[PDB]
Design a protein around this ligand. Sequence first.
Ligand SMILES: O=C(O)c1cc(S)ccc1[N+](=O)[O-]
Ligand SMILES: O=C(O)c1cc(S)ccc1[N+](=O)[O-]
Lengths: 83, 83
Amino acid sequence: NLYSSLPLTKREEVEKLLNGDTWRHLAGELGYQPEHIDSFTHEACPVRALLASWGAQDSATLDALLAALRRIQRADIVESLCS
Amino acid sequence: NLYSSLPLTKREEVEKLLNGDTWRHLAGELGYQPEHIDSFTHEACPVRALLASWGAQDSATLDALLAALRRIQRADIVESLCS
Ligand SMILES: O=C(O)c1cc(S)ccc1[N+](=O)[O-]
Ligand SMILES: O=C(O)c1cc(S)ccc1[N+](=O)[O-]
């Protein structure tokens, strides 16, 4: 159940919810080192680019993402995405 | 013919086409000052948030955007969106 496969419309909502610093926290939890995170701030849309990059692995499931969101104490985002 | 009204899937192309610094140049041409532009780097997706902010005006037409792209020497982006 790959994250990539997710329709643009829900992905759009994912990205909206990872606002501010949250994509950085998520990236840390996903195994990205801080300088690797910093590299993504060069993109026009750091959060999308991070997820496009991460989303190219085979392990990059929606549920893997939700789990990483739980692990950074953002279950509110999970609740929000699921409701 | 408002930019906002544009379908998400074309807005995706726009944002992708404004890679790197381009949205900063675009914003400058659109009337935003450098520190005002700098404020959008706090968002997870600066380019989208800038366009969302710009797009709330009634004058924020796709064609106004195209003209700002010409004025910034990015006719290539215009060509791409049009073809
Ligand atoms: O629609 C789903 O497949 C979905 C389900 C849950 S529980 C959380 C986020 C989701 N999104 O947005 O993909
Ligand atoms: O589809 C259109 O209305 C469109 C037309 C031209 S000429 C350029 C960009 C566009 N996009 O992407 O909206």
